[PDB]
């Protein structure tokens, strides 16, 4: 026998009419990709006539991207689709009642780099609106990043509050997280696998049907709604633990006086699917939101659903431990620099520190949740002047970034490399010795961009993360 | 500006006469690979008349090997090298004196009762013999698997006490471990990159020369001796950690009623390199020597030297807590089997358990530290009777294992799978149901070989590591 949802869905036929709420970095390529598909009729992108965002309706309704910025193929694609009557931007949210599938791709901000919980108000709004206008036989996919259990929890509860209908009876609900990078938007979508999880089999197939058409090389990875949200968190939690594994090897190697890079490359010689080890690079910390928060969401997720967990006792989980080792890396950089100044008898209080790197990703502009900030704070509290350099980061809240190397390195007692920028990989000992003066300048390298022998030979007191065996060198 | 050792070395010239001590599974291929390398002149292999092993002298000198057929080039390699007069086995250790380099490739087997350190007695006997006949400018290489700190610690003390000369001044000292397996000896040594670590740069470079000519495809990875020793522990540690990682996610997935394998395939859709999370497979536990013991070696290792470890306050080494996750899995298997009997109103006591699988690798004959042992022990204490099956493992000490599945499974309350043997992947629901007799027989899967729906539909009560969402199945 067929269940109630299955009847309704086969009774709808296929998906012809798609709606995308959230006209930002992620919902625009989505809506437009949906619309560029042969087998779909219209897609409606929903955007309220805000004084902040109303201009998106007119920019988009004419084939133009409201964003920053160039994003290869994007402007072009929107144009392609606006012309054919297959894409329209609207503030009329009561449309939605006319759709087969509705998707929510609303940005999920964060107040301050305020620890764990992003702000969801914009998203919950989208969901209320969906619920207000939701009809039986509709497919609703949450595409925003959400914390495990949101689909089966609140998202379901408000969607059912608003409509009087039941998820998995009157309508389908799924989650399809969008793993995506600005710059490579359209084709990352196109080219890699999409995770798709409904609250039931009926909902996951209805979604497979949504996402299949947009893919050229990517496949859909079908699963449950919760399994999908946990996949987002787990992918970050695991990369985090990989980083914390080598950071810890780095610390172990320093105490043993050996080079972590040689141990790393020995480990790395083990190749093969299910064999590798997949060893990452050690460094001066971990920045971003995902890598620094997703284990807490996975752990909160275990807690919120009150399923029965057995685990060794009541302690910390390796993931939490990974968070803490990774979090310690800035203070470790600092102990290194204090140690380096000590070899000369030089304090900190009233030292100049030239910090090289605010962003934490090589040749990039995001300093969000930067390991550089906890480091700056330790230097400032201990009594040092600090000047900061980064050739990409433009304007950061209440901290001065100079683009002028040299202005930054002038009179510096210590030069501290926190970001693996290309510019720092071309930093020559000669120049740094001559612009900082001093007589023994200190250089602390947290990103494997300094060749130690060049600097040591130049009068520098060198330290490097995980370095032998370099750190107790003669000057 | 040349060092003393460097001079002796340039004055001795290129390596021409090589010695291998340890005519065992590894030292015979090694010695015999060296002797085949044009560029080397003559290799000596060193054997006592250990009544028991005395014979190898004469066997080898006719051109023959030991037990079980190897890389069926081994005997032909010996024949070739012996015929060309480039290899000879001798009981006369005094001839170490005649050599440019000597290698210690002595089985470091034990044990016998296992853990925590190997039985180095034969190894240390060899080093003594080496020390005893050591001459200035010779190179000594540890090829046997050792623990961090052995080369710079006891290996050199013995070498130094016996000879009365100094390592890194009078003679060169290195560590070149191999990862090798029987049946694959010749190509492992040739195609596997070879970690070679000297106690100083001079010994490293001398040792690279010893090993470059037998590599064909493999490459030499040069580092410090101590870094070499750490490399092998780090490879097991990092693997052990990847296992504790998924095992852990499996516990979390159980709590959330979701499938670990969907999470895992989701995660694994991120493709490397430097990107892959290289996700392994969760299970009933970790066995072996290396994987279970190495991280205790790193731990001790971090503390043997002069050097301060900077680590966050309170702590727990990530690796130490990997060992505990993985040590827990037998107890987790046990809780799942108890839980499955609860569903029926049965208790471990008085119930019969059929252990399918005593080895821990899919189709292996070895149960060195089987996670099946602590599991078997939990059942026996709770008052259950136990029958153990395994197609391969014969003669476990003080523990009786059986060939025939039927007798093991007949009348059993719980069927519990701990090795992924192929026999268990072919296990069909009907058969286990009837042989167990029962009505609602219990099957618990530690190795992802049992298809849940087949067994659930046939009346079973099912549990598998990290299984949804199959474990709360109506039966």
| Selection from B406, B475, B404, B418 nearest residue B442 by Cα | B475
Q: Which two tokens stand for residue A83?
A: 């012309």
Residues B336/B263, Cβ–Cβ less than 8 Å: no
Residues A441/A233, Cβ–Cβ less than 8 Å: no
Q: Which active-site residues of A does the annotation give?
A: 232, 290
Inspect the interface and report whether the beta carbons of B235 and A307 lie closer than 8 Å: no
Q: What domains lie within chain B, and their CATH numbers?
A: 1-224 (3.40.50.720), 225-475 (3.40.50.720)
Query: Closest chain B residue to A149 measured between Cα atoms?
Result: B256
Inspect the interface and report whether the beta carbons of B277 and A148 lie closer than 8 Å: no
Query: Closest chain B residue to A177 measured between Cα atoms?
Result: B266
What span, in angstroms and rounded, lies between the C-alpha atoms of B102 and B197?
15
Residues B349/B383, Cβ–Cβ less than 8 Å: yes
B290 assigned to active site: yes
Phi, psi for B79 (deg, rounded to 5): -60, -40
What span, in angstroms and rounded, lies between the C-alpha atoms of A314 and A304?
17
* B377 min Cα distance to partner chain A (Å): 18
Per-position DSSP letters for A27-89, written without gaps between them: HHHHHHHHHTSTT--EEEEE----TTTTHHHHHHTTT---SS---TTHHHHHHHHHHTTSEEE
Query: Closest chain A residue to B267 measured between Cα atoms?
Result: A235
* A26 min Cα distance to partner chain B (Å): 19
**Three-state secondary structure along chain B?**
CCCHHHHHHHHHCCCCEEEEECCCCCHHHHHHHHHHCCCCCEEEEECCCCCCCCCHHHHHHHCCCCCCCCHHHHHHHHHHHHHCCCEEEECCHHHHHHCCEEEECCCCCCCCCCCCCCCCHHHHHHHHHHHHHCCCCCEEEECCCCCCCCHHHHHHHHHHHHHCCCECCCEEEEECCCCCCCCCHHHHHHHCCEEEEECCHHHHHHHHHHHHHHCCCCCEEEEEHHHHHHHHHHHHHHHHHHHHHHHHHHHHHHHCCCCHHHHHHHHCCCCCCCCCCCCCCCCCCCCCCHHHHHHHHHHHHHCCCCCCCCCCCCCCCHHHHHHHHHHHHHHHHHHHHHHHHHCCCCCCCCCEEEEECCCCCCCCCCCCCCCHHHHHHHHHHHCCEEEEECCCCCCECCECEECCHHHHHCCCCEEEECCCCHHHHCCCHHHHHHHHCCCCCEEEECCCCCCHHHHHCCCCEEEECCCCCCCCCCC
- List chain A residues with CB under 8 Å of B308: 255
Burial degree of B324 (CB within 10 A; 0-12, 13-18, 19+): middle
Inspect the interface and report whether the beta carbons of A302 and B255 lie closer than 8 Å: yes
Query: Closest chain A residue to B196 measured between Cα atoms?
Result: A266
What span, in angstroms and rounded, lies between the C-alpha atoms of A113 and A290?
12
What span, in angstroms and rounded, lies between the C-alpha atoms of B415 and A339?
59
CA distances, A286 to each of A244, A367, B49, B142 (Å): 9, 11, 60, 39
What span, in angstroms and rounded, lies between the C-alpha atoms of B418 and B285?
8
Inspect the interface and report whether the beta carbons of B251 and A310 lie closer than 8 Å: yes
Q: Which residues pair with B402 in a beta bridge?
A: B389
* B15 min Cα distance to partner chain A (Å): 25
Q: Which two tokens stand for residue A471?
A: 């750190």
- List chain B residues with CB under 8 Å of A324: 312
Inspect the interface and report whether the beta carbons of B226 and A279 lie closer than 8 Å: no
| Greatest distance between any 2 Cα atoms in chain A | 85
Burial degree of A312 (CB within 10 A; 0-12, 13-18, 19+): middle
Phi, psi for B164 (deg, rounded to 5): 75, 30
What span, in angstroms and rounded, lies between the C-alpha atoms of A159 and A135?
11
Inspect the interface and report whether the beta carbons of A318 and B244 lie closer than 8 Å: yes
Q: Which two tokens stand for residue A474?
A: 């003669």
- List chain A residues with CB under 8 Å of B238: 245, 267, 277, 279
What span, in angstroms and rounded, lies between the C-alpha atoms of B103 and B141?
5
DSSP A407: T
Residues B57/B92, Cβ–Cβ less than 8 Å: no
Residues B17/B98, Cβ–Cβ less than 8 Å: yes
* B253 min Cα distance to partner chain A (Å): 8
Strand order in the sheet with A42-46: A87-90, A42-46, A17-21, A101-104, A139-142, A172-175, A194-198, A220-224
Inspect the interface and report whether the beta carbons of B279 and A238 lie closer than 8 Å: yes
3-state secondary structure at position A172: strand
What span, in angstroms and rounded, lies between the C-alpha atoms of B133 and B130?
5
Residues A328/A292, Cβ–Cβ less than 8 Å: no
CA distances, A408 to each of A432, A436, B234, B311 (Å): 11, 9, 39, 30
Helix (H) or strand (E) holding A173: strand A172-175
Inspect the interface and report whether the beta carbons of A251 and B310 lie closer than 8 Å: yes
B83 assigned to active site: no
Picking from A189, A233, A260, A269 by the largest number of B CB atoms within 10 A of its own CB, the best residue to mutate is A269
The residue behind tokens 């709360």 is B472
| Greatest distance between any 2 Cα atoms in chain B | 85
The Cβ-side half-sphere exposure at B443, using a 13 Å CA radius, reads: 35
- List chain B residues with CB under 8 Å of A317: 248
- List chain B residues with CB under 8 Å of A191: none
Tell me the angle at which helices A225-256 and B318-342 cross, rounded to the nearest 10 degrees.
150
Inspect the interface and report whether the beta carbons of A223 and B277 lie closer than 8 Å: no
* B431 min Cα distance to partner chain A (Å): 30
| Least CB–CB distance from A277: residue in B238, B306, B311 | B238
Picking from B195, B218, B234, B242 by the largest number of A CB atoms within 10 A of its own CB, the best residue to mutate is B234
* B363 min Cα distance to partner chain A (Å): 17
Phi, psi for B267 (deg, rounded to 5): -55, -45
Inspect the interface and report whether the beta carbons of A266 and B335 lie closer than 8 Å: no
What span, in angstroms and rounded, lies between the C-alpha atoms of B87 and B129?
20
Residues B142/B58, Cβ–Cβ less than 8 Å: no
**Method in brief:** X-ray
Inspect the interface and report whether the beta carbons of A223 and B301 lie closer than 8 Å: no
Query: Residues near B470 by Cβ (< 8 Å), separated by ≥ 6?
Result: B259, B452, B456, B462, B463, B464
| Least CB–CB distance from B321: residue in A149, A258, A321 | A321
| Least CB–CB distance from B251: residue in A241, A267, A311 | A311
CA distances, A96 to each of A62, A205, B317 (Å): 22, 21, 53
DSSP A21: E
The residue behind tokens 């959330």 is B256
Sign of CA dihedral B298, B303, B307, B311: positive
What span, in angstroms and rounded, lies between the C-alpha atoms of B258 and B183?
42
- List chain B residues with CB under 8 Å of A184: none
Cis peptide before A387 (omega within 30 of 0): no
Inspect the interface and report whether the beta carbons of B302 and A335 lie closer than 8 Å: no
Q: Which two tokens stand for residue A191?
A: 């080219």
3-state secondary structure at position A142: strand
Sign of CA dihedral A122, A128, A134, A138: positive
Q: Which residues of B136-172 are buried (b: 16+ CB within 10 A; e: fewer)?
A: bbbbbbbbbbbbbbbbbebbbebbbebbebebbebbb
The Cβ-side half-sphere exposure at B62, using a 13 Å CA radius, reads: 7
| Selection from A244, A278, A251 nearest residue A336 by Cα | A251
What span, in angstroms and rounded, lies between the C-alpha atoms of B306 and A73?
58
What span, in angstroms and rounded, lies between the C-alpha atoms of A156 and B292?
45
Sign of CA dihedral B408, B411, B416, B417: positive
């Amino acid at each position: 026998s067929m269940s109630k949802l299955e009847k309704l869905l086969k009774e709808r036929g296929p998906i012809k009419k798609i709606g995308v709420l959230g006209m930002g970095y992620v919902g625009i390529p989505a809506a437009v990709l949906f619309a560029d598909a042969p087998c779909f009729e219209k897609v409606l992108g929903f955007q309220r006539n805000s004084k902040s965002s109303g201009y998106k309706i007119e920019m988009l309704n004419r084939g133009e991207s409201p964003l920053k910025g160039e994003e290869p193929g994007l402007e072009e694609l929107i144009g392609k689709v606006v012309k054919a009557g297959k894409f329209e931007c609207t503030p009329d949210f009561s449309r939605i009642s006319e759709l087969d599938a509705v998707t929510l791709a609303i940005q999920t901000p964060f107040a301050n780099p305020k620890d764990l919980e992003p702000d969801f108000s914009a998203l919950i709004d989208g969901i209320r609106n969906v619920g207000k206008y939701l009809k039986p036989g509709m497919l609703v996919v949450l595409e925003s990043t959400i914390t495990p259990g949101t689909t089966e929890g609140m998202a379901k509860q408000i969607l059912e509050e608003e409509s009087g209908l039941k998820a998995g009876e009157d309508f389908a609900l799924a989650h399809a997280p969008e793993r995506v990078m600005v710059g490579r938007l359209l084709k990352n979508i196109r080219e890699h696998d999409r995770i798709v999880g409904g609250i039931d089999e009926a909902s996951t197939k209805r979604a497979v049907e949504l996402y299949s058409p947009v893919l050229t090389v990517g496949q859909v990875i079908p699963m449950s709604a919760t399994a999908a949200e946990v996949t987002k968190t787990a992918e970050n939690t695991f990369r985090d633990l990989q980083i914390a594994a080598i950071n810890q090897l780095a610390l172990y190697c320093e105490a043993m006086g050996i080079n972590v890079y040689d141990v790393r490359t020995g480990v790395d010689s083990l190749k093969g699917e299910g064999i590798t080890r997949a060893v990452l690079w050690p460094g001066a910390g971990v920045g971003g939101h995902c890598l620094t928060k997703d284990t807490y969401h996975l752990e909160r997720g275990v807690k919120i659903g009150r399923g029965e967990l057995d685990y060794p006792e009541g302690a910390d989980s390796i993931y939490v431990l990974a968070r803490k080792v990774n979090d310690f890396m800035p203070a470790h950089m600092y102990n290194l620099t204090v140690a380096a100044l000590e070899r000369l008898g030089k304090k900190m209080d009233g030292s100049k520190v030239a910090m090289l790197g605010w962003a934490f990703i090589k040749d990039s502009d995001d300093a969000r949740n930067t390991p550089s900030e906890p480091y700056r704070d330790l230097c400032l509290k201990a009594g040092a002047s600090v000047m900061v350099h980064d050739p990409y980061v433009v304007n950061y809240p209440g901290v001065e970034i100079s683009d002028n190397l040299e202005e930054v390195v002038r009179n510096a007692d210590a030069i501290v490399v926190l970001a693996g920028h290309s510019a720092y990989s071309s930093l020559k000992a000669d120049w740094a010795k001559k612009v900082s003066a001093k007589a023994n300048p200190v250089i602390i390298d947290g990103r494997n961009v300094i060749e130690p022998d060049e600097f040591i030979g130049k009068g520098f007191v060198y330290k490097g993360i995980g370095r032998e065996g370099h750190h107790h060198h003669h000057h």
